[PDB]
Structure formats: C-alpha cells, structure tokens
Amino acid sequence: LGASWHRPDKCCLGYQKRPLPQVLLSSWYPTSQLCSKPGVIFLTKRGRQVCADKSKDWVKKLMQQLPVTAR
C-alpha cells in the first residue's frame, strides 16, 4: 500500500474477450512491459477503457484503424 495509485496496473490480466466496434472507439494506449501479460487498452470516444491483446484479431484491426494515445 502507500500511494498504490502510483502503480498503474494497466497490465490487465484479462482482456475484453469480445470484439468492439470502432464506430465509437477513439484510440488505444500500450501498457508496460514489466507485466506477466501486458497488452493494450482502448479508450473509447466517450465510452470507457478496454483491455485487449494485439494478438487478438479485432484488436489488431483497431490498431491499424486507430493511431495511438500519444500525449
């Protein structure tokens, strides 16, 4: 504990598991590499974040459909 927030557990242990539509998606940001199984989270336009693994199929298309959260 102690400012645990300082630790961004973005390395979602599990992923969406389902293919979401880019019709409402915005972009996607990659997690750290110091994880047991880090992938990439998708930040919908106005929806929410979604952990996914580029390894997937729909997650791959999105990567090409969207750029990446850089800021």
Side-chain angles (χ1 to χ4, degrees):
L1 240 295
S4 219
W5 86 276
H6 274 262
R7 178 232 264 280
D9 239 20
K10 323 210 156 197
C11 324
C12 269
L13 301 151
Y15 300 94
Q16 195 53 57
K17 212 189 221 153
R18 326 169 122 200
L20 340 177
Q22 192 261 325
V23 55
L24 80 316
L25 216 44
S26 222
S27 353
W28 52 275
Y29 76 84
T31 165
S32 262
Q33 222 146 23
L34 311 327
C35 322
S36 240
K37 45 208 241 181
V40 185
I41 288 86
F42 278 77
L43 321 95
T44 65
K45 292 152 74 162
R46 180 166 179 181
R48 271 185 119 169
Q49 270 133 34
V50 171
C51 298
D53 260 354
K54 48 190 248 216
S55 245
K56 299 257 157 172
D57 282 44
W58 57 274
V59 179
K60 201 179 173 129
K61 218 174 240 200
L62 297 149
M63 286 209 129
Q64 259 173 347
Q65 268 248 352
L66 321 177
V68 103
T69 82
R71 196 60 260 166

